[PDB]
Design a protein around this ligand. Structure first.
Ligand SMILES: [Ca+2]
Ligand SMILES: [Ca+2]
Ligand SMILES: [Ca+2]
Ligand SMILES: [Ca+2]
Lengths: 149, 25
């Protein structure tokens, strides 16, 4: 279909604004470091500077919207299961209770620009929920992402 | 409903509010 709507650029635009506390228009290594440092990790500035210059053509030292967009929009694979499997579950199970509640999945859903219905909501979670307990456990999630059948 | 389920995960990957790419590096 290849729809692609403002909802895509908006999501990225919102995140970008987050990185640029001083909404200057372009993220700087320093600002980027501050955000990364406050991300529960502190990578070496070496790879950070090299990584930034790697994508940034004119390697001006700052990532422009066009660069940020393509940067992420382009890179979208995995290379790390425990990362995607955990990162996703972490988002779904906001409260991190070990189970995905309809309400939690409801937001993570519409929050993406989708108006579901009572019927869809039921089958939405009820389908993944093998125990029909109106909730999905991490175990069920992994299996659902694996076999899927 | 397996489609929407994957869509939610796929969309989340695109959104990456944590920056899987940058966060990883
Ligand atoms: Ca800035
Ligand atoms: Ca640049
Ligand atoms: Ca929960
Ligand atoms: Ca279940």
């Amino acid at each position: 279909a290849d729809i692609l709507s403002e909802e895509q650029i908006v999501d990225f635009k919102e995140a970008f604004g987050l990185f640029d506390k001083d909404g200057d228009g372009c993220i700087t290594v320093e600002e980027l470091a501050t955000v990364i440092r406050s991300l529960d990790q502190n990578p070496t500035e070496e790879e950070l500077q090299d990584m930034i210059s790697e994508v940034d053509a004119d390697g001006n030292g700052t990532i422009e919207f066009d660069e940020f967009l393509s940067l992420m929009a382009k890179k979208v694979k995995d290379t790390d299961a425990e990362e995607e499997l955990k990162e996703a579950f972490k988002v779904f199970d906001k409260d991190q209770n070990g189970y995905i509640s309809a309400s939690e999945l409801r937001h993570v859903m519409i929050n993406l620009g989708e108006k579901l219905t009572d019927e869809e909501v039921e089958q939405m979670i009820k389908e993944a929920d093998l125990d029909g307990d109106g909730q999905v456990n991490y175990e069920e999630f992994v299996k659902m992402m694996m076999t899927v059948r | 409903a397996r489609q929407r389920w994957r869509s939610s995960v796929s969309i989340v990957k695109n959104r990456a509010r944590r920056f899987r790419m940058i966060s990883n590096l």
